[PDB]
Design a protein around this nucleic acid. Sequence first.
RNA 1: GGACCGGAGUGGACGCAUCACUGGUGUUCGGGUUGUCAUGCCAAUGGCACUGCCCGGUAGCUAAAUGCGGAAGAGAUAAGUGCUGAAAGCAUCUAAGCACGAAACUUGCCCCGAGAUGAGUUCUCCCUGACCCUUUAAGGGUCCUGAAGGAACGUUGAAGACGACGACGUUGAUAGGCCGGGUGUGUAAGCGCAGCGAUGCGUUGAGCUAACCGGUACUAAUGAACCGUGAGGCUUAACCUU
RNA 2: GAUGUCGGCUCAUCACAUCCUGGGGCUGAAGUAGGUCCCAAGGGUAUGGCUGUUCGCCAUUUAAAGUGGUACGCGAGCUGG
RNA 3: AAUUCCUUGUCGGGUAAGUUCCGACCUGCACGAAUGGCGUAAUGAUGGCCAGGCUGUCUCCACCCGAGACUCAGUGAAAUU
RNA 4: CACAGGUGGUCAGGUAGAGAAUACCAAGGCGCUUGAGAGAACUCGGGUGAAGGAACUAGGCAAAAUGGUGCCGUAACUUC
Lengths: 127, 123, 209, 114, 56
Amino acid sequence: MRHRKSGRQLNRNSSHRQAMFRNMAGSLVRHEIIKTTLPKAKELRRVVEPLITLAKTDSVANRRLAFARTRDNEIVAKLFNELGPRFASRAGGYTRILKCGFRAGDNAPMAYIELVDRSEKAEAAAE
Amino acid sequence: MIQEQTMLNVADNSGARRVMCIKVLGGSHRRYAGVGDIIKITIKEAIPRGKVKKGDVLKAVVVRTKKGVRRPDGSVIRFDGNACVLLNNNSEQPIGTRIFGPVTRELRSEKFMKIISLAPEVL
Amino acid sequence: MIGLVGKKVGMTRIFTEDGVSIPVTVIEVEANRVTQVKDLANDGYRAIQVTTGAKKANRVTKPEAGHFAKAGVEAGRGLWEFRLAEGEEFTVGQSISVELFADVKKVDVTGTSKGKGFAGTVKRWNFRTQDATHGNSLSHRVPGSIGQNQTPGKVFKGKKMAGQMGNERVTVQSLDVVRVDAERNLLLVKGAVPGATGSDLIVKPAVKA
Amino acid sequence: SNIIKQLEQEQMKQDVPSFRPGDTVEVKVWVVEGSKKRLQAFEGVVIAIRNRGLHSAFTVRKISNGEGVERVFQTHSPVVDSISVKRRGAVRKAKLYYLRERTGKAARIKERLN
Amino acid sequence: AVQQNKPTRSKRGMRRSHDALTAVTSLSVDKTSGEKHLRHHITADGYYRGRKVIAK
RNA sequence: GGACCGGAGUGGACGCAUCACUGGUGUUCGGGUUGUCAUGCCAAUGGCACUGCCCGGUAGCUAAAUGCGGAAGAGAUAAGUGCUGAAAGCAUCUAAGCACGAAACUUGCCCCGAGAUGAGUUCUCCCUGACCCUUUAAGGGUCCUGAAGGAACGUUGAAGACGACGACGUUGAUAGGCCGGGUGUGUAAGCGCAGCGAUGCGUUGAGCUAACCGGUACUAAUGAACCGUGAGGCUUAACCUU
RNA sequence: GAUGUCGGCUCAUCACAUCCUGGGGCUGAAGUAGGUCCCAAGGGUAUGGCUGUUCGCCAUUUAAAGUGGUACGCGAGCUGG
RNA sequence: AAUUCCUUGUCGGGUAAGUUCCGACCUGCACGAAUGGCGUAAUGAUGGCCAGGCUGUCUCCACCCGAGACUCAGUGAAAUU
RNA sequence: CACAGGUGGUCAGGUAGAGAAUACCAAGGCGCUUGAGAGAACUCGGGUGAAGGAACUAGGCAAAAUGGUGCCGUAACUUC
């Protein structure tokens, strides 16, 4: 069911959904490449890209607003000064997803998610 | 209104405070009613020195509702409570000589219109 | 003779000539073509086969594409067919956009409804609810009893129970025609129509008792 | 007309008066006095803003011979004639339907001038 | 509730008629590496959609 | 006191469809507000106390909302009404004959339905193979060589428990993001001015924004591979002067 | 070598020696009824008081407030009075 | 009447209507004074009745959310036959 | 049973409060060994239910509602 009500249930209330994707977003701006399950990667792109879109617009009010995603004092200095400005020539799509099938012998769908403009080093084998 | 056995305020000078409905009139196997319906009603909280007396049984029509009246154009006329006009049980027409507060287009129907000769609001 | 194919494209509420409100549904109707007309060996009378829409035709099969090439290279979307009698409808594109139902006062619109997941179940059957107090056990919307006794020893055939919706064809009949505009696909009908915005339908003349 | 937007834009008014919530207003409206049309007027405070397309409607609240009264009005309908602003009170919220229960800033106000 | 008579091995066999493993309709093949895989997924050699990816 | 067929308007009981209207609901939107913690602090913002609490609310769902359907006409027929008329030189609605006649029946209205294996019917599309052994309306082996279409996968849906069903995958606007619009909320933060200060005033009809909607290739939708091919058994009739 | 309740709730379904609705005969059928009575099973069918309650008595509304069958219709569905 | 048969006794009050309730009645169902009579305040996880507040218990069933339902990998029983 | 169970005695912090009540929170401890999806009706639990307001049900049971401090104010009846 749930027609024209887009979202992801899967587990506990919106407070847990926030705390999980805050941590996974913080990890993605920390490492610039992340391995995570496919339905979590497919939701992270809907909340991490509007943070980067806010980061294209530098102000005191916007940099206090980014504290709603990451409380870390260095990530708020990487946003607006590098993250955001480094995508200013692009029409969104600051991230990309790479689908890696199931976990071996199991059900769990696994993926990579990364920043599109980063320094390349992943051009080698998966195994 | 949607429920039966319910208290209504008076809108005319025949009595005081509240009166209780016992049935809606017209239609059968029925339960829903509005300002266009006649109801059967009992005297509960009115003074015995008025035009009414304790435990007497009348007819009435509803004239204000907290749900409101919508059909004149497609948008709501609303009121702060539920109130009615008291009528004779055998032959209808109002027993009151003076009405207070606003009224409706349905209050201008042949069986009720004798008390609105003073042309009140929303008639 | 034939119906006319359309789609529900919006719902609204507009003013009459005396200024009070009237509810309406906006229907897109698509211009009529005829693919062949069939011989008396089919149906029992003649039959008429029709198209209205078109598409990019990437996902259209050669079994369908050779037929739309026969029908004037129309790149058609959907295919419908009806009985033909008394009238002399053309064997090629007729280009009727709204004009079949411009002068007809009411129409018997056959809609397709909307998908609802579960709506073969419970809410479909208006079952009386079950109490959260007064002792009542393990029930809130369920039917309770579903049959008679050990004597018949069966639930009755066709009786109300659980099921998927998956959507289904429905005709409410005799909706009033408020407005039309030719070559601009407009049909406007009073009140509601089955399905959501984007749901397909066919329009018919008024044929109720 | 185009089946999208233009079909409903041809039924909208192009000179709607500039009232908003917390304005005390007079609303002129046709009452249909039997077999002929007649104009009437309603006066009270605006408790809801009007912006929702061709369906745009506002709500005004008052009293009538000791009874509490409210009217919803359709913006674009021909039955609603005109609106005049009497006073402008500051009420903050977009809709004040809780003012049917709360008396806070209901009959006492600071001039809004917006 | 419980059974009134135990079924034969035909019943367990007929309930199980509709289940099978690895119904992928053959593998995909990666023109860039010669590896085999499931469709629209990365190969073990990291090749996908014309380049090597997802290495750490 | 007091008429029927027919015509017109309308209420109740019942069902159906929708989310436009008027309400509800709206833990993923905006604002107000209590206790308390965090960020060095202030300012401010974020965590937590039922979604802390309160109010408005896009999208979606939905009646207490709104719209629609409730049997006409025709056919056959029961009770019955009726004509012609006999056994019974007459009579009689019945025997032969024969007219009229109900809400039940058939047709007419709604929906499923060719696995209807007793598988209707039309239209569009596609493929032209062979060697060897023997058992020969035949089977087996092996090699040359694949179409219509199907399947799988992706992006995923006003289709959905799974399956099934729909659109799009450069024959790209299918999803995310972006850009813009729009609904919703209600005049932010920073600064400056005013005040002892709570707090106000100005920039400011501000700031913020979701599910809707137009545009957009920024991001994501790979080469394939697989199944399926080789013009399709036997007989009688008709027709092709084969 | 199991019989776990009636009245009720939910969900119902069937019958006629037909409650109402369609047609028709008779009347002590003026009209309006009321009584009676034949054919007829497609659909429709209450609410509230006191009672564990069907039934009863009582009030109100309406078209009428009606009769019978179904492990006393239905707990591997609801109440446990 | 935790006593009363018959009985839903008879009358008053509340209510449109009260087998219940509360007051009054009985030429007294099988009432009767330490297996105590009558009666009063406060107390009761107290039996029955009533008014107000407020409420989805309901007329009538509507939305949102957690968990289970559902899919898949691992481990994989039972009452019963 | 590495069982949502039972088990005598003892000590204490910031904001807050009458407090060993109670919410947030410090120190310190817990993260409850099937794992990952799905986003179904339904069912249990939880929030909201327009209008009426116990009409429901054996019975407002349950739920909602009420809910504090200070001061003013306070009846029947009573053993005062």
